[PDB]
Ligand binder design. Structure first.
Ligand code: NA
Ligand code: NA
Lengths: 557, 558
């Protein structure tokens, strides 16, 4: 029979199915933190819920050792002092294994129904999650709310819809009847059982814990697997809150709450994670993080299906424009948003050394560079007007990388530290913009984490496009952006995007930035290049997380 | 625009889509070699086409070194002396790369249409292909025709249908319009381009070259990839004919025929294959063969998506039956078919040491074992009555393993050499049936390729089922078969199949054998246990062979 939570959320599920196929605009979760949607005291109650976690041990009723763990620090300088019960990998693998049977037996309608109920409760907790994302990742509140709450919930629901889209096409049974020409037909009844892989592992991200973490977590749950969530040690709380709500729904639905457990760690957890990632019980791994750690998992966890999001080189090709100032302002927003700490933020900006055509005539390379650098300075230089745009720097390693990057080319706009007006100890810095030549490719085919960008002089737009496609294919990329008023250049940009396996944005001169993507329309990554071996989300992202075990028996024709 | 070959075969495509979802019986390719369907001279014309390949170099217009290659031998003792143009991996990778662009740009309707047209022509060549399978794999003619022709074509069409099932869900474009609170809406046009992975590699099998080879080949083609087909050096001709016909269709459709090339080799090609499998241009690999080689590819060809069919331990659990003679005969056919050289053939037969309940009373262990051994002897001992059932032994290594197996336990039925009445030099051997105890685990968890089986005494059906599920999960398995009249035992067998990740057959006492599987209903392998990392066929089998590259641009709102 159909699980009650499936029937409760069936309309939302059906709408999501239509959304992934039509790929227009759709979102069931209000992205604006409006009192109309979330209540007049939504913000206040959320903030108090966040504050209640500080200076205390986060309660989880999963098997735990009696020791605690946790060293999260707020980029805004707020004391956190949050602790979590320390569980061993052994203990969590055992608890997941004990939880697998009744979860599996409840079948797809339960996996989908429970997943959608959890998403409904996570949306209700959006403010509490927003504050927890802000004070672990450093995202400004508005972005922490959207990226940590509704937008992450959108991507989670997208994954559930893709899961259901595959599951719903597999019949529970079939009558197989083959005529035997005047002899009686062969007739058998086939029965098909959906069997999840087993236990999945979610290895969390330090900048977008829920947005990057949710697709794998809910792809696992929607296909009947159990999940161990191992967040980035600098951003545990958003996923601890998530796990708590998931366990509530599973417990109320009559399942073992250890279908989902939380493995909190402190930094230097590498040996622990390597050993856990190779355990025979771990059949799925979803990882967001460094290229070296991601590729390590792909090459060594042979017992698991490994899905990875890694670093890439995001690129802008500037050929020509209808309004240099509008293009420059859009690029500047894209560089300043969360201080370039988005996996989709642009890094390399290719401009012909001889300049570009504009509506107001020709612009030299130097004029294009000054237009970008000046627009960044206008957006970021004033603390009162810019802190909500640039947010806070995630870790103390960026300051050293900023100074390293200063030496790499010619400085167009220096990075400076700002004093946040509301957080005296916040770690805040404006973007660094450098000038390079195409001859310096050794410097710009690297990913530079933080607010660092290179305006790079090329021989021609043809070279910009050849290089951009080559670098995306070889070194990975999540986004590619082109500015041109010429149809043939736009066509060549599509060829480069196909070559590079990277999503293309064209003439972004308004309110859409290359950093942004919408669930149910935009594939996040392609899975074709070294920045990620999977796309968020498509059929391939979910279709392997379950198997089908059949049986056959003769029946009457 | 819709390719003409897509429109031509659209009705077959739509019916195949409906078939994979409902999973009843359906096949567009007639499995009987009937004159009604294939012409009154279908067999004769097919045999003449087969003979034309003997004693000459197989013609392909792909890049070649001028040298030839090929050392195929017929298990029936017929002189083949077939050679193929020798090409290097380097040359074929370059030729595929040059063919990729215009093939990719023609888009899904061309990939599907060309694939369906190739399948139509392969069906018309079924007799020629049947003879080529017979004289490389040793399959008797009827199985060579069905398994090499129509049934393989069924599985190819199944793979194309699953591919199209994913491709058709992706819009070519979308109008994305997002309302803005009292401001102009954000309006963008999205465009989605389906991009193949690149060049796929098909690593062929010596027993079922087309049946095992076609799903990967046509999944590759139907998703726009180029393909290098590397057959097993003992069974090239069936895939050489296939590649020839594929290239014909591609050429006639205005494509570079090097979308599909043939890399024929001589034996001991393992190092060449390793080097090829690791090339950065090889993005997909479909492999059928040993567990060790398949495992090597999964672990070391990290740049490719690897789909493998490997070895496993196929098992029968005998608990009880309503007709021992009928059950024994069915098991006997399953052991005798193609001399146990099917990847789905049973090897281990578990029987309680204290016997079983039947409808005609109690039967001892020795009575069950003798029932099986005697039914096998009746079906296989006489050349004239058995040759069309047991076929020929593929290579002399199977003969060696039969003799190794003789020493392992108590022989219930010895394997004999038969003189084929029509092929004086054919290699024909009857099944070897041995008795073991459950304590002999070290022996019966190994794979014994060939007509070798063990009737194994267990403490109870409880132990039989626990052992079968454990062995399937640890060592891999393609089939599990259970005989019981008890509902609780059937329930336990379902649990064992789920644990072992293996398809279950229940009370096969008639004309369906555990060896058999039908496209569009039976998943061949699950992908859950060590016998295979993929199922033939499902969504996971095709959904990763293409990617989607999108673009977005602002447009006017509606
Ligand atoms: Na950046
Ligand atoms: Na066998």
């Amino acid at each position: 029979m159909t699980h009650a939570l499936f029937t409760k959320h069936e309309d939302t599920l059906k709408r999501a199915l239509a959304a992934i196929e039509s790929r227009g605009y759709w979102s069931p979760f209000a992205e604006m933190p409006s009192p109309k949607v979330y209540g007049e005291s939504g913000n206040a109650d959320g903030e108090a819920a966040f504050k209640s976690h500080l200076g205390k041990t986060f309660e989880l009723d999963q098997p735990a050792s009696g020791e605690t763990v946790g060293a999260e620090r707020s980029p805004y300088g707020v004391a956190l002092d949050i602790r979590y019960p320390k569980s061993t990998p052994d203990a969590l693998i055992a608890a997941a294994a004990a939880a697998q049977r009744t979860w599996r037996e409840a079948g797809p309608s339960a996996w989908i129904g429970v997943s959608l109920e959890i998403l409904a409760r996570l949306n209700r907790a959006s403010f509490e999650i927003a504050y927890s994302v802000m004070h672990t990742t450093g995202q400004a509140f508005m972005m922490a709310f959207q990226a940590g709450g509704p937008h992450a919930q959108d991507r989670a629901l997208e994954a559930v819809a893709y899961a259901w889209d595959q599951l719903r096409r597999i019949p529970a049974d079939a009558h197989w009847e083959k005529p035997q020409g005047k002899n009686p037909p062969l007739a058998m009844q086939k029965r098909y059982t959906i069997v999840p892989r087993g236990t999945g592992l979610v290895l969390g991200c330090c900048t977008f814990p829920t947005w990057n973490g949710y697709p794998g977590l809910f792809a696992d749950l929607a296909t009947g697997n159990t999940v161990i969530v191992k967040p980035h040690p600098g951003a545990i709380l958003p996923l601890a809150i998530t796990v708590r709500i998931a366990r509530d729904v599973l417990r109320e639905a009559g399942f073992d709450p250890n279908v989902v457990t939380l493995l909190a760690t402190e930094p230097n957890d590498g040996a622990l994670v390597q050993d856990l990632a190779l355990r025979p019980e771990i059949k799925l791994i979803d990882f967001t993080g460094s290229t070296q750690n991601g590729t390590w998992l792909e090459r060594h966890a042979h017992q698991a299906q490994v899905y990875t999001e890694k670093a890439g080189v995001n690129q802008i090709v500037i050929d020509s424009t209808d309004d240099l100032k509008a293009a420059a302002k859009n690029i500047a927003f894209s560089l300043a948003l969360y201080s370039g700490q988005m996996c989709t933020a642009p890094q390399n900006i290719y401009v012909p050394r001889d300049g570009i055509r504009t509506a107001d005539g020709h612009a030299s390379f130097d004029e294009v560079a000054q237009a970008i650098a000046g627009a960044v300075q206008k957006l970021t230089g004033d603390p009162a007007r810019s802190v909500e745009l640039i947010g806070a720097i995630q870790n103390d390693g960026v300051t050293a990388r900023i100074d390293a990057a200063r030496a790499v080319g010619r400085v167009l706009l220096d990075s400076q530290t700002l004093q946040h007006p509301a957080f005296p100890d916040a770690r805040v810095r404006t973007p660094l913009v450098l000038q390079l030549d195409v001859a310096d490719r050794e410097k710009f085919t690297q990913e530079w984490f933080g607010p660092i960008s290179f305006v790079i002089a090329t021989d021609s737009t043809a070279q910009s496009l050849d290089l951009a496609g080559e670098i995306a294919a070889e070194h990975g990329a999540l986004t590619l952006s082109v500015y041109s008023t010429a149809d043939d250049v736009i066509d060549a940009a599509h060829e480069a995007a196909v070559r590079g396996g990277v999503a293309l944005s064209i003439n972004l001169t308004g309110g859409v930035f290359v950093n942004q993507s919408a669930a149910f329309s935009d594939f996040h990554g392609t899975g074709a290049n070294p920045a990620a071996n999977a796309a968020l989300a498509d059929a391939a992202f979910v279709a392997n997380r379950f198997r089908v075990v059949q049986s056959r028996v003769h029946v009457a024709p």
